[PDB]
Amino acid sequence: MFLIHFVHYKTILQKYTFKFKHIFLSIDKYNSLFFNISGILIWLNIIHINIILIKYSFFILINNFEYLIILIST
Amino acid sequence: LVRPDVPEDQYVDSWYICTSMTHHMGDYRPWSASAPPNAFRFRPFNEFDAKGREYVQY
């Protein structure tokens, strides 16, 4: 039987906060140092030189993977 | 001069390239920064040259 009619209180208080980072926030990426390329030399069958900026080059990279390439002041 | 006139400790003889490079990319410290302030002929100490220092010490 029913004796009464009432209004339904509830305590919805969130007072605690637990947020956990999903895994992919910590995954790696590939980051690189970046300087302005002053020049480039490519050689595979035939050598080719491109010069963007002529200055005394303070750093030089050599990379052999497919074609021989030399990145000047890179 | 082929390369800036600087104490040679700043240079490295490059692998695979006939050339020297700077072991700090492109930064340069002048001779004055190797010696003490106002060091005669930039010198650890002004009294003597390297050998003079050796045999005085002995």
UniProtKB/TrEMBL annotation, chain B:
Protein source organism? Trypanosoma brucei brucei (strain 927/4 GUTat10.1)
Query: What is the name attached to this protein's record?
Result: LysM domain-containing protein
